[PDB]
Design an enzyme around this catalytic site. Structure first.
Site, mmCIF file in Angstrom:
data_model
loop_
_atom_site.group_PDB
_atom_site.id
_atom_site.type_symbol
_atom_site.label_atom_id
_atom_site.label_comp_id
_atom_site.label_asym_id
_atom_site.label_seq_id
_atom_site.Cartn_x
_atom_site.Cartn_y
_atom_site.Cartn_z
ATOM 1 N N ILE A 12 0.835 -1.193 0.000
ATOM 2 C CA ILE A 12 0.000 0.000 0.000
ATOM 3 C C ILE A 12 0.875 1.250 0.000
ATOM 4 C CG2 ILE A 12 -1.816 1.251 1.208
ATOM 5 C CD1 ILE A 12 -2.662 -1.376 2.461
ATOM 6 N N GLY A 13 1.765 1.353 0.984
ATOM 7 C CA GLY A 13 2.656 2.498 1.075
ATOM 8 C C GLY A 13 4.037 2.148 1.594
ATOM 9 N N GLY A 15 8.763 2.392 7.620
ATOM 10 C CA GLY A 15 8.812 1.085 6.989
ATOM 11 C C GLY A 15 7.906 0.961 5.775
ATOM 12 N N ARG A 16 7.309 -0.218 5.608
ATOM 13 C CA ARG A 16 6.412 -0.494 4.486
ATOM 14 C C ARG A 16 5.098 -1.137 4.938
ATOM 15 N NH1 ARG A 16 8.335 -4.621 -0.164
ATOM 16 N NH2 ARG A 16 8.652 -5.939 1.684
ATOM 17 N N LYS A 32 2.451 -3.632 8.880
ATOM 18 C CA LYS A 32 3.498 -2.644 8.740
ATOM 19 C C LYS A 32 4.781 -3.366 9.101
ATOM 20 C CE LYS A 32 3.184 0.668 11.636
ATOM 21 N NZ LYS A 32 3.396 1.633 12.757
ATOM 22 N N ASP A 127 -0.103 12.762 17.921
ATOM 23 C CA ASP A 127 0.204 12.780 16.495
ATOM 24 C C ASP A 127 -1.073 12.892 15.667
#
Ligand SMILES: COc1cc(-c2cnc(N)c(-c3ccc(C(=O)O)cc3)n2)cc(OC)c1OC
Ligand SMILES: [Cl-]
Ligand SMILES: [Cl-]
Ligand SMILES: [Cl-]
Length: 251
Positions: A12-13, A15-16, A32, A127
């Site tokens: 998806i995006g 890390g990864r 993730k 956040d």
């Protein structure tokens, strides 16, 4: 469980984060990946404790973290969580900017209601920005993801003077996020942080677009009060006549 229990569908995006399927029941999830290969024992111990706390957060408006997998081969830690098919709020705002198309007041009220509930749960356990707010397939809004170059658009007046615990600072950030959802731009902008800070200090911004009600404008404006004690509490936000049952989460 172990990585073999799951099949990676695609990334998806990066890390990864990857969309994955749990083989036992075919359930669609996300993981993730964190590469801990360059970490010290001290950093891994911090990491472990943070992942553990992450696992304790069960709330309809917080991204659910299901599991953590260790693959000593790749020195990779996988954090398995629910899949939010709607993506993040940052992409929704980008989508509107380019469509010349404002978001429905009803959507903004969903995000206000559900994120306020998420904050309420975070404060209890003791956040906020668009890239950290996720949308599922049932109109639910979820808070996820618990340094330089970037512009600190949502930094509160007090937090720019001295970074310290203050729940009213979270309300300011929520204000900024809701403002941006409406106006499709943050309430305070600048090309340098010094200029940004001067603007935030002055506490002035354009009204959100006229298609939004005076009542929505009023509560967002209250969240952006320069005085932390004039900003509404979580409790005071949820008492607002705008917020109704249908704006809350539904399974
Ligand atoms: C960042 O952009 C996207 C993210 C997602 C997505 C879906 N489900 C998730 N659980 C997440 C997610 C990923 C990471 C974290 C985290 O680091 O805590 C929290 C939530 N992202 C899906 C997306 O589309 C399906 C997408 O593209 C817009
Ligand atoms: Cl527009
Ligand atoms: Cl939407
Ligand atoms: Cl839900």
């Amino acid at each position: 469980s172990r990585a073999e229990d799951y099949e990676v569908l695609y990334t998806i995006g990066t890390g990864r984060c990857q969309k994955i399927r749990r083989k036992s029941d075919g359930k669609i999830l996300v993981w993730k990946e964190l590469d801990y290969g360059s970490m010290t024992e001290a950093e891994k111990q911090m990491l472990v404790s943070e992942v553990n706390l992450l696992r304790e957060l069960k709330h309809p408006n917080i991204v659910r973290y299901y599991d953590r997998i260790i693959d000593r081969t790749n020195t990779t830690l996988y954090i398995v969580m629910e899949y939010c098919e709607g993506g993040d709020l940052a992409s929704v705002i980008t989508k509107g900017t380019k469509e010349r198309q404002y978001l429905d007041e009803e959507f903004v009220l969903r995000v206000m209601t559900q994120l306020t509930l998420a904050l309420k749960e975070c404060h209890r356990r003791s956040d906020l920005k668009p890239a950290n707010v996720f949308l599922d397939g049932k109109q639910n809004v979820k808070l996820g993801d618990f340094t330089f170059v970037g512009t600190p658009y949502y930094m509160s007046p007090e937090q720019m003077n001295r970074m310290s615990y203050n729940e009213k600072s979270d309300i300011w950030s929520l204000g900024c996020l809701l403002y941006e959802l409406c106006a499709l731009m943050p309430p305070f902008t600048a090309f340098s942080q010094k200029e940004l800070a001067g603007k935030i200090r002055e506490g002035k911004f354009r009204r959100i677009p006229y298609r939004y009600s005076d009542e929505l404008n009023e509560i967002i404006t209250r969240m952006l009060n320069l005085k932390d004690y004039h900003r509404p509490s979580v409790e005071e936000i949820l008492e607002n006549p705008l917020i109704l049952e249908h704006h809350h989460h539904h399974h």
